[PDB]
Amino acid sequence: DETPDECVTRGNFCATPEVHGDWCCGSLKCVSNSCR
């Protein structure tokens, strides 16, 4: 790992969380369709 741009960064839009659970970089959470 170094700089995975394959994950969605903080403040960016995330799709419905429960279906994938993973998507946002690091300790970011998919909530309100946004990673934080």
- The structure's method of determination equals NMR
Q: Please check whether residue 26 is in contact with residue 6, taking contact to mean a CB–CB distance below 8 angstroms.
A: no
C-alpha gyration radius of the chain: 9
Nearest one of 14, 3, 16, 5 to 28, comparing CA atoms: 14
Q: Under 8 Å CB-to-CB from 8, ≥6 apart: which residues?
A: 14, 23, 24, 25, 28, 35
Domain region containing 10: 1-36
Q: Which DSSP helix (H) or strand (E) runs through 31?
A: strand 30-31
Amino acid of residue 32:
S
Q: How many domains is the chain built from?
A: 1
